[PDB]
């Protein structure tokens, strides 16, 4: 048979004989660019991936057809206009070629105030308030949707987004770019339920849709604006010297956005390698396919890694005697630029059919951006697998192993809204992982017309060797999760996450004591969960690995670990990101901390009646997951 | 194109749209850089001479007390706006 | 091994040698009566059931401690007073000995209007409106909570509940009784989450709590009121001749309720017989233990059946070689007279640990009330098991088999709010069964001080043979669900339920086409679910019955059938009865029909934008359950 | 108890509570069946005379223009209420 070392070599052997740069080159040909979601060239690349999966001889290939509402530019030009001296002096700043999807169609006019990146901290550290005025913000740090939401939260009437040259060293100052301002994922006009014909598309509007117009402008347009603005941008921001803060007294900005909705047909292409022991369980490997521009780095690299991962793994099963216990699903989503729409509609549609069957999602999107750092954002259940992978996968340039920081897990950042792996983890309770070889600065040409293969190979000369290591990381992920009778998911990694939450909450024990409350039951839950994980490791130790009945009895308890952290007390339709650790909403553990921090200030920003309910449900959500992991219901303690 | 612009300016003012509003409509319908709203014809001549003198690369057409300016480079467009603010 | 015929006989022999009347007599002794929730006598009976479970030598015995808020009488007397001629004439009607738990503490004064049983239809078919007036209603037909909720919806200021002699043939006309008016289940001050100390009891109020005072009065008090009321009660109602409709011009009724809350400790007592093959799955058998009065019929019979069912099955495992594959849990809840509090807090507390492990709940509450009829309310998944049981279980009196109506399943009514098996099915997605030997009239002494053993054996002389057949029915339920490699759950029974929904919905095809909608995708979902059940039956046919893996692979799909009907789009905290078939809320299939029923009438009661969302989410809930039952996700072919 | 009622009704009226309100307080504080509020003191005895004649099983105590009636059986209590309405 084949052990891990035999499979690691057979994977590493086929990686050296794989040409990745020629595949990325094919996906960037004239027939597949540009491929905005629902376009004809999007359907062309979908049909190519569909045929490629059949030639690889997978177990089965199928497709889903969704009809989602997106937003596109109108025949009427969007404009940014400066008006001076009571509307008697007008100045055309830019007729942008880009736009922000899901912006509100409106024309707002008033003061323009700079707010750095638009984060909540940036709006707090501002001299001028943004009440009733238009806001201009630099791209980065947070998603377009978060910028708009934070400006809306302070009653701003509009948002402008540009790319300064300090953070985005781009020679073309007239370059336009694209984004979306929906504070969520999926089709925002079918929130919480799939975009199938069965629903007959009832009137439903996501609460994440903004209610102010937002427009993107080039750096030249932003420098046109700064010539009409006063105040020096602080040195903390580390931006261009042409930066300014607030328009003059008699000067205003007239933002005109007139985007329109468009019902489009999107295609999700799938391929599956059926398992040999437990085929009803499976891992999912996905990669975004659509892009506003050419999307070589955003979409081309991801799809290329997906195509060759399916070819290599299908070759190993048929030609090298690979026998995975669980199945493997390869997926090429569409409508990813609008906010993981193709992937979210799949989860929202087949949630019942993959409740406790899909146990890991791997996202190959934007896996190659640079060569300096190897960053990863994932669920703690995959931290141990990621650590083991970094210890025997060599850097393309350095040649040393990826594992160089022993405190790497304490520095990991959580998955963000723009990541296609976020809805898998925060909504469906499926452990997810996103990884990339990148630099400390953002890939500047993302979301622009310059995200071509020419610009990608010029910045990364070793693109083939770098794309090979990205496949080796994702390849080792799939093998470790599918070949052995034991799942490489590490449930013990949540003991540090829970202990960090209880310790962080204990720093405000003074506020808790004066409200007549106690953290003693939250400590009890952390300890009850710790002992449940220690008992499960003991049960796995004394387990006869060949006894399939006892093993899947224990494996079914592991695949429930991530699910039992979804909040059982919230509506998945109006609050779909239910994961108390990584989701969004008042039910999350970070939301509990932000509220309690507001009590030491005498103002009534604190709610108390909400906090007491937050502490109650969060305490039992942890205690409930602990009691389910301990074993049977009759094996629980009482005080 | 000057013939087309001046004829579109004729309709907006006859329909009853304000001069300030018509200025914004002109910039969003044609490839014009800066539009100035003037009181009498004296300033309209003052503004038109001043901008042609310092920026001769610009084509300036005017109708009634509203002056339209078409220029193409970011740098020249900058100078026209600064020239119009100075002479207003 | 032991087959079914060997186990059916081994159970039937121990049933004949079991004394049920002596246990019901013991539970009605002076040491365990009365046992209001949280009382000392309630805790005494808990230790008896706990010690009896240890003597039966079960696998494990344990108990849970909850701290729930109930409502009890105040030191201030509740009063019903008639006031005439501008407060200058006062008339004491009654200082009632009963009360309605969770009624609002208030003093209301105004007109009194009769509303028959208080159902929604009764308030619609009424001449006088009840806005700003007190309402008096007969007990029965619907729960106390439904009566109060329907009156509040029409701006009533108070509710009086009495027992007429026609529906309740009681000789004592001054008898008071007890109930609760909470439109829900569980501790109404911890809605959606368990009543443990861990929660630290945050300020939360269930939306089912009423905001009007509710009081129970005796028949004599009601006849005192009717002497000040005009109008003849319709002959349709079939009530007493002393009945009247509306008070006189100058007369008002002053209802004064001042009940207070009380935090109490309740006990849930448990015992388990562990399985031999798949012990992580189990059936649950429960029975309410507390009662306001003696509760012989309400609580005594149920707990007595629970005690002897645990003794017989434990005897069968140790002395007769019974080896059930799955486990059996015996539970004795407390605070049952309130909103099924003891059972609901257990579900709300350990929901994660019994997500796909507990696959059936059997409710023994009020299983003996009469002897004429044998009634059953249950989930369709257990219809086949119930039908198979009725074909070899003899009636206590007639000696004939219980299976006498071949079209019995079409006449079954769904579980009601007052039934302890309702939250198991409508909230946790666990198939449930409630059954009883009863008569066409309600047991009159339920919720009164006359629910004694003496009145129960006097009305039911063959109580031992009746309680034996009730135990035989529940016994055969447990055996069929635990001994064979098949769960005996019939998933095909939902094909008739879906077909009935489509037929009822086809009646409004005119309205559907007129709003630009189509029933074609709901047609596809009904057929896709039928094919999913046929594929699973085929898989069970070709299954190697000895192959333990393929059987539990197929059984895991069966245990998800009931769960996949809980609405995935509703908040379990603010609307816990999520089951689209048997729950409550706008997400249920009847709610879709009730709304669409308001469109054919020209009135603006219809809410289009709500219906379009109802039809959308209900369509996919059915299609999703079909796609999950078909098998793997890649093996779901449809005409999408 | 007649002394206690007559003194407790005296305090309610001395404290400033109206006769109509004091009538309801007596019924929920004492074991009283019917209370009648009359205009003059002549009617107070007339109502008491009428009720003692036709329902002699009743104890009728009166204070000022408020007359208190104590009876125990459902039928007799009914007859007292009907007698007070008749003579009021
Ligand atoms: C979990 O929550 C429940 C409900 O809040 C809580 O139960 C309550 O605990 C308190 C504290 O033990 C109980 O109050 C005591 O009851 C006993 C029994 O009669 C009394 O002897 C106590 O009196 C002492 O304390 C008084 C404080 O003023 C003194 O005045 C007195 O002289 C005595 O020193 C006290 O009344 C309360 O009865 C229960 N509730 C119920 C319904 O029984 C429980 O303690 C919590 N558990 C934990 C671990 O926190
Ligand atoms: C599932 O839903 C989608 C969305 O409604 C359906 O697609 C739509 O189908 C209609 C009718 O075939 C199309 O109408 C046509 O529109 C074109 C627009 O140019 C017009 O010229 C034609 O005269 C006709 O009116 C509509 O365009 C189309 N929408 C999209 C985005 O493709 C689809 O048919 C539904 N599928 C099923 C099986 O019901
Ligand atoms: C602090 O947070 C709590 C939430 O925990 C806020 O309570 C909320 O208050 C509003 C307004 O009173 C409630 O809205 C109500 O909805 C019901 C639904 O039927 C409706 O009947 C009422 O008329 C009202 O509109 C809301 O439900 C309630 N939420 C909860 C969970 O109770 C509270 O307002 C916050 N405090 C501050 C100062 O913001
Ligand atoms: C008809 O039903 C819709 C759907 O429930 C109601 O719309 C809701 O209105 C409330 C209050 O504005 C919102 O909080 C909900 O989000 C709305 N739901 C939707 C789906 O829009 C509407 O109010 C109902 N109309 C009437 C007259 O009852
Ligand atoms: C009940 O409603 C009717 C209709 O408006 C109104 O005339 C009447 O005064 C109301 N009665 C009360 C007691 O509110
Ligand atoms: Ca959707
Ligand atoms: Ca509760």
Residue numbers in the entry:
A (entry chain A): 121 to 759
B (entry chain D), D (entry chain C): 1 to 88
C (entry chain B): 121 to 760
Which passages does the manuscript contain on this structure?
However, for strategy 2, one design (designated 2DS25) clearly bound fluorescently labeled hTfR. In the 2DS25 design model, two helices on either side of the central beta sheet extension make contacts with TfR across the interface. To probe the sequence determinants of folding and binding, and to facilitate determination of the structure of the 2DS25–hTfR complex, we created a site saturation mutagenesis (SSM) library in which each position on 2DS25 was substituted with all other 20 amino acids one at a time and screened for hTfR binding using fluorescence-activated cell sorting. The key interface residues were also conserved, while affinity-increasing substitutions were identified around the interface. Combination of these enriched substitutions yielded higher affinity variants. The structures are virtually identical with an rmsd of 0.26 Å. In both cases, the design binds the Apical domain of hTfR using beta sheet extension and overall closely resembles the computational design model. The structure of 2DS25 superimposes closely on the computational model with an rmsd of 1.2 Å; this is notable as the fold is more complex than that of previous computationally designed binders. The structural differences in the receptor are at both the backbone and side chain level, in particular at Tyr211; a superposition of all hTfR apo and holo structures in the PDB shows this region is flexible and can exist in multiple conformations.
We sought to use our protocol to design a human transferrin receptor (hTfR) binding protein. hTfR transports transferrin (the major carrier of iron in the body) across the blood–brain barrier (BBB) via receptor mediated transcytosis, and this process has been exploited to deliver therapeutic payloads into the brain parenchyma that would otherwise be blocked by the BBB. We developed a computational design approach for designing binding proteins with beta sheets geometrically poised to pair with exposed beta strands in target proteins of interest. This domain is distant from the transferrin binding site (which is important to avoid competitive binding) and is exposed and therefore suitable for beta sheet extension.
